[PDB]
Every structure is written in structure tokens, then in C-alpha cells.
Amino acid sequence: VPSYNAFVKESKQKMNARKRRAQEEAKEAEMSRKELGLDEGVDSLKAAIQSRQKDRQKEMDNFLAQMEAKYSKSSKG
Amino acid sequence: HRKVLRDNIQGITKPAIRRLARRGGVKRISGLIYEETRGVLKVFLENVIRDAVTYTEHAKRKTVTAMDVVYALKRQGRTLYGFG
Amino acid sequence: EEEDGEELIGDGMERDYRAIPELDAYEAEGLALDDEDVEELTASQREAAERAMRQRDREA
Amino acid sequence: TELLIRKLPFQRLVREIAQDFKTDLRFQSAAIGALQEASEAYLVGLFEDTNLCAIHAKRVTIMPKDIQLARRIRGER
């Protein structure tokens, strides 16, 4: 059963299914990309990620400020 | 008294990683996403817990208080995204 | 190999959001209920710890 | 709050990780809670950035490749 020809057919089927899934992933990814509002290109991706990094930095700053205002000896007195 | 904890990285189950990804907006995940997530979180936790334990040790205590973790996270915020 | 992407918003997703009382609460082992010997770090202690940690990081 | 990681597995994992640094240790519950909140915020932000990196590459299925790409953009290694 595991002949060389049977392996060729399996490999071709898997390659074609991979191309199909790649096209489906590309369509869904464009749909989501416009659904999220990110401009096309690589630099837009980096800019959005770094803006989110700044936002998360300020967020954890606020979080640690809360932790200090609740558990520190300076806040208690 | 030599009790040891082991293989609790599996405590981060597949549903846990799925909830994290859905909170992050992920629609579909790869099969090998779970192991990568476990490794990333383990490295993160190791690097922050070492500093928290160092703070507790310098406090001449043996219990990690909340301010130990606060200072560990504050020190981590300076080195985590320093591009290396 | 290279199977389909595992969907995350499929049906039965509420199974990932079931409540488990055995795991949704912290256990008592390893926690500090005796609420002293939890004194905050003094400035000397904190500075010494941080400088030792920076030396250790340089060593790596 | 919402459910991302269950509290008992995270507590066991934190204690397992910590026992390799000091032998016998206790933890304030607020310390474990802050650890969990910081870890979950970090992981959800990393997942958002990974999803951005995946949809840039014409995919809605995230992969460890996209995770490492997002980490490299954020400034981690």
C-alpha cells in the first residue's frame, strides 16, 4: 500500500489543500484587517503595536500606582 | 520534609490559552501555539519571581509580600522591552 | 501536517467558561495568613537587592 | 473579574517556579493576585500583537512564528 506513487498523490493532495487553506486564510485575514482598522503595510503594523505598547505601559503604571496606594507604608502612614 | 512541585505548567490548560487568545482577539490558533504560550509565560514568571524572591530575601523575610511583586514588576518594566 | 486552524469561536465555546470551584480559588498551602514578618523593604534593603540583581544580570 | 487562568493552577505554578530560588517560602495572596493580573495583561497584549502580525501575513491562524515576530517588534528577547 505505501507505494511511491501513493505518496505522490498524497503529497499533491496536501499541497493543493494547503493552497486552498492559504487562500481562505488570506480572505479571512483581509476581512479581519479591515474589521480592526489597521492600514496595510509593515510599518503600520509596527506603529500600531508600539502605540499599544505605550498604552499598556501607562496602564501598568496606573495599576502599580493602585497597588502602592493600597499596600505601601507611605499610603497607609 | 523535601516536598517538590512539578509539571504545573500544564495547569495552563488548552482552555486557559484559548481564553487568553480570545481576550486578545485571536480567531484561530495553531496546534503548537499552546507550547509556545507555556514557554513564554514560564520565562516571564521565572524572570519576575526571581526578582521578587530577591526582594523578599533582602527584606530578611521568608514570605513574598505585595510590595515585593510591585518592585519586581517595576524593575521588569525597565528591562523587558529594552530590545534585548 | 499543516492542518486547519483550530477555530476559537465555534460552538460549545461556553464549555471553556464553565466554573470550577476546585480551581477558581486559591488554596491555603504556601500562603501567608500570619500577617507579620511582612514588613516592607527599607530603602537600604531595596537598593542593595537591586544593585545585587544588576550585578547578577551583568554576570549573564 | 473575568476568567482567563484559574487561580489554583497559577498559584501552584508560581510556587513551583519559586521553590527553585528559595527553599521554603510563603506568599501574600495579594502578591499572587498581582502576579496573575500582570501575567494575564502581558499575555493578552502579546496575543493582540500576535494577531496583528498574523493578519499582516494574510492569516487569521496565529503561529509561534507570529508570536516571536510580535515579541521582536515589542522589544523582547
Residue numbers in the entry:
A (entry chain D): 172 to 248
B (entry chain F): 18 to 101
C (entry chain G): 65 to 124
D (entry chain E): 58 to 134
From the study:
From biosynthesis to assembly into nucleosomes, histones are handed through a cascade of histone chaperones, which shield histones from non-specific interactions. Using structure-guided and functional proteomics, we identify and characterize a histone chaperone function of DNAJC9, a heat shock co-chaperone that promotes HSP70-mediated catalysis. We show that DNAJC9 recruits HSP70-type enzymes via its J domain to fold histone H3-H4 substrates: upstream in the histone supply chain, during replication- and transcription-coupled nucleosome assembly, and to clean up spurious interactions. With its dual functionality, DNAJC9 integrates ATP-resourced protein folding into the histone supply pathway to resolve aberrant intermediates throughout the dynamic lives of histones.
